[PDB]
């Protein structure tokens, strides 16, 4: 029996239980966005604004149900409307992570028919983050 560690084992929603994505794996996900005609977009946040929190609820009556701070991140430029070039998305990842090397950065895509984010995953975490485990240190 291996034991799933509760210590410094923060996750990041979709694909965070898989081994870290290679550049080829990221490119494959970008090709999937393009193949489906979805709208690519990058979002970023400093480390303090990265995970869901409750601080604004100090101002509330009994209305905190499904309210969390830090769900919204900051938009890198605009969603890439009309983008049909995966290399364009990859170049924006490079540009975003260069401008904000110490931020968390995620790639998302929007479907305008459902009007919902249709995919998303973390593409950068700051090098100073110590709150996560290698795939093989998730259980001890």
């Amino acid at each position: 029996m291996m034991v799933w560690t509760p210590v410094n084992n923060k996750m990041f929603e979709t694909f965070s239980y898989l081994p870290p994505l290679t550049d080829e794996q990221i490119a494959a996900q970008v090709d999937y966005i393009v193949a489906n005609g979805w709208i690519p977009c990058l979002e970023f946040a400093e480390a303090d604004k990265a995970y869901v929190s409750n601080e604004s609820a100090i101002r509330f009556g009994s209305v905190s149900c499904l309210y969390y701070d830090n769900r919204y991140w900051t938009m890198w430029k605009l969603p890439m409307f009309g983008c049909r070039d995966p290399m364009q998305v990859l170049r924006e990842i490079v540009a975003c992570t260069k401008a904000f090397p110490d931020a968390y950065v995620r790639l998302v895509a929007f479907d305008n028919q459902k009007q919902v984010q249709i995919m998303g995953f973390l593409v950068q975490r700051p090098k100073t983050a110590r709150d996560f485990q290698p795939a093989n240190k998730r259980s001890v």
Binding site: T14, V108, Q115, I118, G120
Partner: protein, 466 residues
Amino acid sequence: GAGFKAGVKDYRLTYYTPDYVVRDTDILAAFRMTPQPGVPPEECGAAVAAESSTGTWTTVWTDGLTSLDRYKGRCYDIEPVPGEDNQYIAYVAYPIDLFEEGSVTNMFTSIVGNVFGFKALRALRLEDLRIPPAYVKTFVGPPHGIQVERDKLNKYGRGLLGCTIKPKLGLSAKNYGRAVYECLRGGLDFTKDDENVNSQPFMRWRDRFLFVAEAIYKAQAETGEVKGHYLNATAGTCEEMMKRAVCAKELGVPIIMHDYLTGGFTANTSLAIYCRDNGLLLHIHRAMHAVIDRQRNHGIHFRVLAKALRMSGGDHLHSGTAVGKLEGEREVILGFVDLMRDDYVEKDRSRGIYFTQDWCSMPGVMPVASGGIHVWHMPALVEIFGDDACLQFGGGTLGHPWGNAPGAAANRVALEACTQARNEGRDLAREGGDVIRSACKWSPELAAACEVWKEIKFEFDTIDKL
């Protein structure tokens, strides 16, 4: 014109109208009908139309004070059923005027109230209903729906993962919260009360709600992901049901559940309205449905019960698994999953969709695949449902040899590996076993789960065939 004439006449004289052109505001019903010997299909269809709308067994004078043409239900078409000597699909049209706005209860009371018990028929099954936009618009509908739910949870790009705590009954409130915490922290988005977990001597509801809140918040802080547990508001009275929903609101937790058929449509609609007004997600359990919907010859098909739930209100509804311990064929499930999720569904008899259904922007309901499923089913589940579903592993989590957190991790790893493979262009029907086996190489949790349930399948002759 015409005097009142006392006495019995054939229903077909008034209620069989084969040349009637249906109106776009009419509610339409497709009845699989098995007449008694000596009862013509036309008279049997007319009797069903009559006794679910305006008519009784003998002529009444009071018809003359009103306009029967305006109000009567109309059997307007009868199809023979291929392969059946004594089965017919009778199509009935009901004026929109017959129905109370916003009341699924009233719609069922007319359409399925008395007609199934008539001596003159041997069996009757309601297969489908065409709910027109003008009637759909009278309903509040689901508290939130799929898009709003994902937005509130901040969860995108994969199926959601859930889990029913086991044993069904017998756990204390504290042990319940202990199990919930261990499940959620391993990678599941949700856990849930079993359908029959309400308030009982071994575990009172408010004790459970409190310990579960502690568990939810511990797992959320630990993982950095939004967590929830469907707290059961199902109760003996509307007043008890509301007390439970209020407590969930006051704890700030995301989601409650209701057994809509055993609690009932009246209580369910009330609860869905409360959830809308207070921002609670509402998970719907379909306990008792198979009493009604299992047999081909008699009852009400689940697709009708699913449409009724969408109207009454629910953010999630159980849909079946195809591959698990409970019955429901893939093609049948795909039909009503479209009816649950989509805005517009074209008639498609090969999936049992008898009518084109326009939902006129009523939000979609998240299908929940649950019951006897495990890690090896994951590729098939992802292929069937796509991302907009919740997949639930009760035994498939709490039956893991290393406990709940490793069990949750195995299911989460399997889901994400399948999703990734799907996104990369892989064929999950063919390559699913390979995707799972590849993931086992870097995931000891998944490998342990795969080993335990490798030989486990549920394959039986299907009762509810199209």
